[PDB]
């Protein structure tokens, strides 16, 4: 079967197919994904007035990200169930091309909302010291866009051309490291002149940010993290990838948003935790 | 026909099929389910300002659970009608694998929202005495997650491997008992220093919690509660399971939420009930 | 063919089929139904602040019923168009079992929201004199539930077993009469110590309640109201049943809610009609 | 082919089929339709507080009509694309009876919301002089209902029985003329004792009302406005009908609502235009 | 294969078909499109109170455009995936006429909302000096309508009749130039008597407006921008067209709306950036 520049899910699905557990788990984990985002949307809107006016733009940008993540994860949850269909004879779910091939790239282009807005929103909670708002924003948005576009191109070749996959992935990684560098500066400057309570929260936000964002390139490589014909080049790797995405999605978007809201509360004059 | 690690609904549906009453009832009871959750969402939002600011987070977390439960019960209602199709010759609804096998596991992963948030929200209404907020929260969330994940694994084997089904179910039960233990403490400490009216409501909340949460392991075992080849290993057991889920869903989420809101009103300075 | 315990719509649809007028009218009347409920939801939310705080729970419960009625009528509108498909050869719409059989029972289980909440909400507008709030509520909810459950069982046999249909219907009717009895008391006690304007509205509410609620058992019997092989055991009876439901739905839920809102305004200190 | 009492769209679609332009335009014009109504819903809600409390009911009734028109135009937009399917051999869209026949009657029953509420809402902005509120309302609602029901019956026969089509249309027209008569009185009485600004707006509202409402009987007759085998008994007439509906829908509902809101602002003590 | 007056996407799709990258990218870029508009809707509503009352109509009109753009881009995203289906034998997505032909004209009719409202909303932020509000509005709306209708007609012939395509496009362009002329005046007059900060924002708005609006005629011509049998008369041109639309949509609607909101804040007495 000719699949071309398609994600490895389609190759596993076309050859071995997916067990009940693999198929039902991947559907459920994506469903949890979009459910968390819509619940988060409600949470971020309803808690707007829990912080001083100046901090409320962070609640609004969290809500903006929730809308993006909900729409994408909802669409992708339906894409999963449309792309793989039960074969009665063998009792496994095989590629159903009438549904279209499954593509993780769907996520990447919506990151053009998520990444820029997640990086931007912290600049409405913390105060910079030596760095300029417009400068940090421009660095975040440029490197964010380049990271996403290069990775988007790469993931199309994860089976068809491992070399292109790894080269584009490496270029994307360079921009990622730049973002990590700039966010560390923002966290450091953010800690300057705020309560120890606020500083603790920013320490947690940095760890959360570092781990949650690194999970995305982890998901990128997932099928090959056990090498050629490894344990993960299987339905187990398919499950692992969507699980990692969902953990990353909840952590990078919702928990990040909640911690920023808690920081905003400590920095708020009237409010306290 | 090879169904593998699938719920017993698919076996009944593939062999005997479902009568009009069994099929139509299961569809209607799931439809009532998601209708209650969306109505509950509206109720919890519209009554936010009926309690003092400090208590409003409980309304918000109720709303969060309503969103999760609505999305899941809506999706599962469609899953039911897609998985079983009318056979004109015999006049019963049989497994339609083109719709996918039906899986109750869909519910379990969304409990990673419901369970943590339901257990958390009471800590925004009652005041603890001897117990520490962070400690109760961490115990609820850890044991909640472990209870859900172990049960999720178990239910895949409810037909294919009764031993795995019962062992995973037993491990899950251990974590459940821990949750019951911690919640009893929270209720007791919550009663200390509040009006007799508030204490009565917490007594009711404990009974509701105990019964409603115990229904879930009841739903887990449903097909085997009348032993091998029992009355319940049938379309009658299929009906019973979804009925028990719906009673549990309405009770554990909505009625629990309403009682907590009523408690918040008694604890509120301005409000009287 | 073998339809078993199915509503008469499926028998007419399987034997005679439906004319363009019968099929298109039934679809349109259900569409009007769900449109009225969603419009009503908007109305009840937007007019919350038109009455004193104490009366606003009635607006909220109206909104809750609108959500239930919208979801059900929307789902049932789609169920109608899925269950009957055009036959080009004869130019009529015949039963399409791939869509499932059509079941009015879908409505009944959602009444477990509508009936309890419609009966409850008046107790937030009128003041009782001799009767106790908790007692009236408990009688409404018990008899409401029993009325619904017994009728739900009955309607499955409306073709397959006329005896069961009529016996279950009669038992259901007994609980209905109890509800009528209790509501009459509530209306009388509500009239005590309020303006003549408020008393006139409660008189209207009683007439509306009596007629609108009686339409439901009317819909139950519809196919047999012209006896065996009567005018109504036909596509004309199918049209009549859904028309009666829609009139009953609009009257019992929306107009009832509007009149209660108008009563709340007269009873409100600041507000005036 | 046997189509029975069906609209002429189905006859054109079954015999000639629709060109790319005819099919794509009819889909797009209905899509614009429902888009305008949902945008209008947002506008009428967001501008509620731009007028004195007493006038806000008019914003609410505008919103109610937006919900009705959105739901109907959305459903009808999907009905269009389901009822006509591309034939590769000839390159035109032909009747696809599996989707159901297309029926304009779908619109008519939703007018039982639109007509009564559009006629009602002006009575919350203007003050009557010689006429009684309840009397004008009752005349509007009775004649409105009769106009709709008689026309609804008529449109089923627009091909199958031209005589019935014209007779029912004529009866409907009589009730329409009554509505025009009553609305002219309302406008005249509304002009009495208000600013020149308010009087100008009521003059505009009358012209808008007269033209926009007359478009509906225009749409009714559309296929025959160029006589037997005329230019309009074609895909061009199909396009014209839905175009006229969309112009009528936007004019009679949204622009009417906006002008009433502007009138409310001029009549408002605090507010200025 | 006879496609008639259809867009070039259908010809490429019917002859060469689309690679995984071409098909998946076009789906993702449209998905990003509608996601941005729904996120924008939330943003424009939530930031209404960030500007003085007089400026809030601009937030409302932004929201109005978001609803239109969301609905259209969502519908068009589904139209893309319905119109092209995977062929297992060659591994490309080919025209699936059962889904309907793909038409960009769908966008054009919704511009009857977007264009008039985008041009209107600036007149609620800037103050005119020489020019009259009603006059600028009328010129914008007339030329906007004529630009859209002439272009709408043109795009049907982009393959079937290049002459009609170019002539209608040229006529449309004339009206576009008129709009550019009037908007330049509005921006110049808007700069008069406001802070240098506000003037800088209007300079940005003019560049954004000029580039973003010019992208639409760019999308119109896209397939022929590399001449006959050029690089762009291919799946690469199909990708380019939808990419350009999405850049234009985000830029002309959301970024334009955000900049107007920022201008409104600078012009607001209480508020500051
Ligand atoms: C191929 C391997 C790629 C190598 C990895 C590259 C990582 C660093 C990239 C860019 C550094 C700075 C780029 C800045 C982009 C312009 C935004 C900006 O800095 O302007 C702010 C303005 O001055 C208002 O203060
Ligand atoms: C600019 C980056 C382009 C990299 C393309 C690439 O690495 O291609 C590998 C080659 O095709 C392996 O056969
Ligand atoms: C955050 C929670 C995620 C939980 C989800 C679990 C998914 C497991 C993912 C990665 C583990 C694999 C790490 C790779 C270490 C194995 C290295 C190896 O096996 O060798 C490579 C091979 O030999 C060279 O050819
Ligand atoms: C089958 C069971 C039906 C569940 C009933 C309603 C579901 C919708 C949730 C709305 C809950 C309303 C409860 C209520 O009205 O309580 C008032 C309170 O006591 C004063 O604050
Ligand atoms: C709620 C879940 C509660 C689980 C209930 C009992 C657990 C018993 C402990 C597990 C012991 C295994 C029993 C077993 O394996 O018996 C099945 C046998 O193989 C038949 O064929
Ligand atoms: C706390 C973390 C749980 C750790 C280990 C539990 C492992 C439980 C696995 C039990 C499997 C039982 C089984 O596989 O049954 C044997 C055989 O198949 C009968 O037919
Ligand atoms: C077969 C024929 C059936 C006839 C049933 C007729 C009426 C049912 C009346 C039963 C009402 C009792 C309900 C229990 C109740 O609501 O108790 C009162 C409340 O608790 C005080 O506070
Ligand atoms: C739970 C209530 C159980 C309800 C019991 C169902 C009664 C079924 C019935 O009345 O049917 C009679 C006859 O078998 C029809 O032909
Ligand atoms: C709360 C009250 C519960 C009591 C229910 C008993 C009534 C059940 C009535 C069932 C009727 C059975 C029947 O009519 O059977 C007919 C027979 O099968 C040939 O016609
Ligand atoms: C609303 C509902 C109100 C219905 C009340 C009417 C009669 C109740 C008395 C029970 C009637 C039992 C008689 C059974 C019967 O009539 O059977 C006919 C025939 O033998 C089978 O096809
Ligand atoms: C809007 C509808 C406006 C209707 C106006 C038609 C006037 C009279 C119809 C009388 C029926 C005449 C039928 C004779 C022609 C025929 O039946 O052929
Ligand atoms: C291509 C991807 C680009 C899509 C990004 C826009 C995200 C959509 C809405 C958020 C509204 C914009 C929020 C900007 C805040 C500006 C401000 O706060 O000043
Ligand atoms: C054919 C080519 C025509 C292109 C002409 C461009 C300007 C068009 C209209 C200006 C109207 C001025 C304002 C109209 C208000 C009514
Ligand atoms: C200002 C409003 C313009 C109104 C009418 C102009 C109509 C003229 C546009 C029609 C052009 C038709 C055409 O170009 O046809 C070419 C021919 O078909 C090649 O073979
Ligand atoms: C936005 C609308 C642009 C309208 C006209 C631009 C066209 C002007 C260029 C002249 C077109 C003549 C032409 O390109 O001739 C076709 C030839 O076959 C190819 O080589
Ligand atoms: C909620 C969305 C978020 C936080 C998105 C984050 C995305 C990344 C950190 C992506 C990084 C990548 C690399 C570093 C290399 C491979 C390609 C990417 C784009 C997955
Ligand atoms: C609204 C969601 C709620 C309250 C979820 C509750 C879930 C449980 C109490 C689950 C318990 C289980 C066991 C104790 C054993 C079998 C497996 C479970 C997970 C069903
Ligand atoms: C909006 C929902 C409402 C008001 C529901 C009302 C339902 C009833 C009054 C049902 C009554 C019935 C009988 C008295 C006999 C036959 C069975 C029932 C349930 C239809
Ligand atoms: C937004 C909905 C509106 C304003 C509906 C208006 C409907 C009419 C004015 C209908 C009139 C008709 C006639 C006068 C004759 C033919 C049948 C009708 C119902 C189309
Ligand atoms: C968000 C919607 C916007 C900004 C729409 C803008 C539309 C145009 C500027 C269209 C211009 C065209 C021409 C100048 C020639 C070809 C036809 C058109 C309509 C695409
Ligand atoms: C369905 C069987 C389970 C019901 C359990 C009832 C709750 C008892 C705990 C106290
Ligand atoms: C308090 C408000 C009172 C409202 C009274 C106004 C009456 C409007 C109700 C309309 C009912 C029309 C019934 C038509 C009967 C069907 C006949 C159709 C002819 C074939
Ligand atoms: C300054 C005004 C010019 C703006 C640039 C618009 C470019 C439109 C061309 C479309 C892009 C073609 C990509 C192949
Ligand atoms: C940095 C992590 C990337 C390590 C590269 C591992 C090389 C994977 O090797 C690939 O494995 C596939 C599935 O097992 C095989 O089908 C391919 O033939 C093979 O190229
Ligand atoms: C706590 C309740 C669990 C007790 C275990 C019950 C044993 C059920 O045993 C199983 O029953 C199935 C259906 O009856 C049969 O098809 C299986 O062959 C049998 O293993
Ligand atoms: C109180 C109202 C109940 C009246 C019961 C009427 C009995 C109807 O009798 C039924 O009529 C059907 C329709 O033709 C027939 O098909 C059935 O064979 C017949 O039993
Ligand atoms: C405008 C109100 C009067 C219209 C009456 C016009 C008579 C139309 O006449 C009809 O035209 C159809 C289409 O050409 C034909 O198919 C029918 O045979 C014919 O009866
Ligand atoms: C301003 C830009 C207008 C340039 C129009 C000239 C291009 C028209 O060239 C067209 O190319 C198509 C494929 O490329 C062919 O199928 C057509 O037959 C041919 O007319
Ligand atoms: Na599937
Ligand atoms: Na089904
Ligand atoms: Na149908
Ligand atoms: Na179609
Ligand atoms: Na497709």
Residue numbers in the entry:
A (entry chain A), B (entry chain B), C (entry chain C), D (entry chain D), E (entry chain E): 3 to 275
Can I see the authors' text?
Microbial rhodopsins (MRs) are transmembrane light-sensitive proteins, found in Archaea, Bacteria, Eukaryota, and also viruses. MRs are composed of seven transmembrane α-helices (A–G) with the cofactor retinal covalently bound to the lysine residue of helix G via the Schiff base (RSB). Despite this paradigm, the first light-driven Na+ pump KR2 was identified in Krokinobacter eikastus in 20132. KR2 contains a characteristic for all known Na+-pumping rhodopsins (NaRs) set of N112, D116, Q123 residues in the helix C (NDQ motif).
To gather more details about long-distance interactions between the protein core and surface, we solved the structure of pentameric form of KR2-H30A at pH 8.0 at 2.2 Å. Surprisingly, in contradiction to the earlier FTIR experiments, Na+ bound at the oligomerization interface of the WT protein is also present in H30A2. However, the region of H30 is altered. Particularly, H30 side chain is replaced by two additional water molecules (wB′ and wB″). Moreover, the H30A mutation leads to appearance of second alternative conformation of Y108, not identified in other structures of KR2 or its variants. It was shown that H30A is more selective to sodium and almost does not pump protons.
